Design a binder for these strands. Sequence first.
DNA 1: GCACGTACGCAGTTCGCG
DNA 2: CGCGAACTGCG
Length: 747
Amino acid sequence: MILDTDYITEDGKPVIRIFKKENGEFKIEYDRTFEPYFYALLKDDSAIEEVKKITAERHGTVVTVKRVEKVQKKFLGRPVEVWKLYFTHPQDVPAIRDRIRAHPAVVDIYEYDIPFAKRYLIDKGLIPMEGDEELTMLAFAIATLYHEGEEFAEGPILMISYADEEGARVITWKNVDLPYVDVVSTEREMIKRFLRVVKEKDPDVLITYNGDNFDFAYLKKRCEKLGINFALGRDGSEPKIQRMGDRFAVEVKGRIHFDLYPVIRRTINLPTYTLEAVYEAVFGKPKEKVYAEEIAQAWETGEGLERVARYSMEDAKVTYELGKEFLPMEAQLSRLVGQPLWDVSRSSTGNLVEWYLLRKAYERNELAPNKPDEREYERRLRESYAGGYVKEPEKGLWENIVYLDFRSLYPSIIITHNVSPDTLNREGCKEYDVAPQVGHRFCKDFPGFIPSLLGDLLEERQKIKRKMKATVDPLEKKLLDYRQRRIKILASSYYGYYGYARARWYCKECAESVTAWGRQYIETTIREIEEKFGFKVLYADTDGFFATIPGADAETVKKKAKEFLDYINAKLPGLLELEYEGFYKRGFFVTKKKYAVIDEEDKITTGGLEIVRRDWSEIAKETQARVLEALLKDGDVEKAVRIVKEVTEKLSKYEVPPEKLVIHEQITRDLRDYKATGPHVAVAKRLAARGVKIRPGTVISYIVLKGSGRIGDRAIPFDEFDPAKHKYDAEYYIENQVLPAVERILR
DNA sequence: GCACGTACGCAGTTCGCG
DNA sequence: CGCGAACTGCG
Ligand SMILES: Nc1ncnc2c1ncn2[C@@H]1OC[C@H](OP(=O)(O)OP(=O)(O)OP(=O)(O)O)[C@H]1O
Ligand SMILES: [Mg+2]
């Protein structure tokens, strides 16, 4: 397969490198025939003579137009006459792109901000991660000595553990008599020994957890400080820390650094994203953690280092086990977008969609729209459109509830009505599809750009969901659930891409249509099931709704539901279909987006309640869960009152564990761009002054202390919470946590 | 040479001023 | 001393 692609400079000309593992042997191919290029639109062909004269300087070397060739392409389906401008080195584009654009004759330039290595993959039709070639993996993690005030990566590395399919081992420079701990005295020698291990085993993939920000970055700093040649790559090169905005990423030429952190953050939604929490969510088994306070104590006292080695070994052990199950999922993702696994595992869903559209646009000789300037980006972010339909739920308890839901509503709407930028208000067509309310017209004579690509993703989701029923192993069922969720988010992102301010194929009118279509279908289906079939819709949210026949029994409501499904699906066009997504005995609808139902097997499923929100303490989630259990199962309202009263008694008496009193919250911005400072923002700003880097996406876990005033002023991180010194604000967790989450069931 | 991180709608908490 | 803005996370 094709692992990755980059380019070096030989005699001032770029040389594309293709890292590939063909027939079980590493190989690097060299292509020196690819030339940088980008298009330009001119008012008159006679101005091409005054365009080749435009020059620019790039550190002494003057940048000139190598060659020029007029090509005929298409822009959103209509033909266009553009001039292709060739260049010597890729870096010549960023130096002359702005000079060529501002020419009074040049209308606009196109495809000027495309990386060379990634332009080679699209133009040459090369697709990475394809081919029956198994990849050798090797996970590794490091243990560090951190002190309050010490700059990051300034302390020594205590242990360097690694794990592959052949077991897990730990390397340290302090005598530990454990069968898996190999002891060698120098930290440098530890690094150098780790260098021999990787070079000897020669893994194709290097799996880490947050290694781009800690494990591999810490190792790279010891490289430049201790003066070591960490030739870890297959070309004799050393790891390179690359910048991606605020975060950084480590690259190892010839190999693939698979950082599982960005992968898990896009696949699983957990309150906290620690390695011990991800292991519990995937494999369903607990993982013990050794904090830095105990690692620093074991290093100084010398006692207990065996347990520290057990933590480092387990760190690499679970990292390989998690990587062995999540790498194939990302390989499939890389095969769809057609980009290296390195870039795909660290890219957002919006970027993945754009990189796939850029490849398909080249396959169809379609000149790609260019990203918006800062002005248009701000203009797109300020504008919006009406979302989905939401109906105020009927209050009270209801019995014999059915949940009818549309099958991929928004994606199906795009394919059925050919909602795409190239088809929006296209003139000269024979058949059109008008969007409700919004009125946007879409050509249906030819398949749209986006609709022609969304069909396959929908089929894949129904295939994965089909194996979920045919799977008996719980581990394979959850892994398949992750795959179908990944396909749902990716497909739905195609819709969200229309509203993405940074999207090349930005189309608000396309996004307005998908919602207008969905709002019309759900509102008409609700009216049809009520007027014709006599159903009573209780709750409705976009693609689905909760309905029932008030006085009918369970057997009647279920049959009439399947009857209405065949009646409405026959009247629905194309891929538009409504599904029977489960029956429920009794249900409770608190408010909008928040409800709770119970099925035949007495399994209570909730939606939008505080039980699944990470910003609510577990003592509140546990109390709310037992209240729903006392109401939906037993139906004893007085029993729930005694439950919340028993919880408050334990809280006031300080009898609840501190682990059950943690509140997780995410830092979605930079600590400098926060208009208001909340509890989690105040704790983050305090950790930023202590050396901890609180970057966007960090989950803040704090505990409210017993005090008077602002909650943020009495908020302390969970790590520094000692029950001997600190005492939590029992009155806060009673009045502002346990009571409110359960008070909304007042009936 | 880039990634500037898919969309809207909404319940609900924290804070701050009156 | 209720309310509005800022903020998060859910569906
Ligand atoms: N993250 C998202 N971003 C944008 N649109 C989304 C997102 N999630 C869902 N949508 C839209 O929301 C509605 C619709 O979801 P399907 O019908 O595609 O998938 P089920 O079969 O799972 O439906 P159920 O939630 O179980 O009723 C999708 O277009
Ligand atoms: Mg749906």
